[PDB]
From a paper:
[name] is a member of the ependymin-related (EPDR) family of proteins. The crystal structure confirms that [name] adopts the highly curved β-sheet fold that had been previously observed only in bacterial proteins. Two [name] chains associate into a tight homodimer through extensive hydrophilic contacts between the convex surfaces of shelf-II. At acidic pH, [name] can bind to liposomes that contain the anionic lipid bis-monoacylglycero-phosphate (BMP) or the ganglioside GM1, consistent with a role in the degradation or transport of lipids and/or lipoproteins within the lysosome.
In the structure of glycosylated [name], the hydrophobic grooves from the two monomers each contain a long continuous tube of electron density, which can be due to a copurifying lipid or a PEG molecule contributed from the crystallization solution. We were not able to identify copurifying lipids by mass spectroscopy. We modeled this ligand as an extended PEG chain; the U-shaped path of the unidentified ligand follows the floor of the groove and was similar in both protomers. All three of the crystallographically independent [name] homodimers (one dimer from crystals of the glycosylated protein, and two dimers from crystals of the deglycosylated protein) are similar to each other with Cα RSMDs less than 0.6 Å, indicating little variability within the chains and across the homodimer interface.
Author numbering:
A (entry chain B): 37 to 155, 160 to 222
B (entry chain A): 38 to 222
């Protein structure tokens, strides 16, 4: 027979490195992922002091239809409507099985599997074999990367759920986006 | 402060190479022989969807040459090698960025991210992710003014080269086409 898809943990926090082709750049962030409540929080990290990217904090509530963008310094808020639907960090059953790799080398390694859902926008995810932790996600339109994103330092559960409760400023914030440049 | 480990300088495995020029990922087999300054790579096709035409590239940097070989007809292209040899290691001059852990608890590897930012007056930064215990390469990313021009992931690494004949070009490359050839069906 053929490999059957495992079940990704649906409550965990860790760190991400996200590449997007629109900018052509990498963004580091902390990432809280609560798939049980369809909600996700992310906090920009600066790598070195070279880009002055202006750090932000984004809170996405898909149970509602909304997301908040918060300057990390001034804490000023932007309320953005959420259009596209909730798309969880798991490997759906309908997905096909591409490949099984091993990362690292002979002494210290993990086995991982690459799956493709092709949800013509195609999605491809790499999750571990033993316990199904996410390592990488890639969304691609006609066979060119629009976005990929790497995950590490993952621990299960959410430590402090207040991460998901927006600051006082978002009680009545603008509606019209904020920049991301100094 | 973290000191850079020593990468293995002979291994074979598989690569996934992203290129921004194409915007695409290409899978291939990779034999890497940094002791002999030479590297061979053999295209793999994902599915039967792109008809990308498979190739085999052999890079001999000691002789300053590289050959591009059709996997079907075995026709060859000899292209002189310009930019110099750059091994898959973390040079000493490199600075230390971050230490991650991939996967989740129990089935995990710790890795270190290092950056050489090797200018050569253009400010092209190099960023490589290597394992912490025994220094195996997992990922390489070259970027010019802070946008990815090329990255490449490595897996299924075993040490040494099993059959070194991979590095001897086929009979046809003894006098090859001398220009580039296409990669399309």
């Amino acid at each position: 027979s053929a490999p059957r898809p495992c079940q990704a943990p649906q409550q965990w926090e860790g760190r991400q490195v996200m590449y997007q082709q629109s900018s052509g750049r990498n963004s580091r962030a902390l990432l809280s992922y609560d798939g049980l409540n369809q909600r996700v929080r992310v906090l920009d990290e600066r790598k070195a002091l070279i880009p002055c990217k202006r750090l932000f904090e984004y809170i996405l509530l898909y149970k509602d239809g909304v997301m908040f963008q918060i300057d990390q310094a001034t804490k000023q808020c932007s309320k953005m409507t959420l259009t596209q639907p909730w798309d969880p960090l798991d490997i759906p059953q309908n997905s096909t099985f591409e490949d099984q790799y091993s990362i690292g080398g002979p002494q210290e390694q993990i086995t991982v599997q690459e799956w493709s859902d092709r949800k013509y926008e195609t999605w491809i995810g790499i999750y571990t074999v033993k316990d199904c932790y996410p390592v990488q996600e890639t969304f691609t339109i006609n066979y060119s990367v629009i976005l990929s994103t790497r995950f590490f330092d993952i621990q299960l559960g959410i430590k402090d759920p207040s991460v998901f409760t927006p600051p006082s400023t978002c009680q009545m914030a603008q509606l019209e986006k904020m920049s991301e440049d100094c």
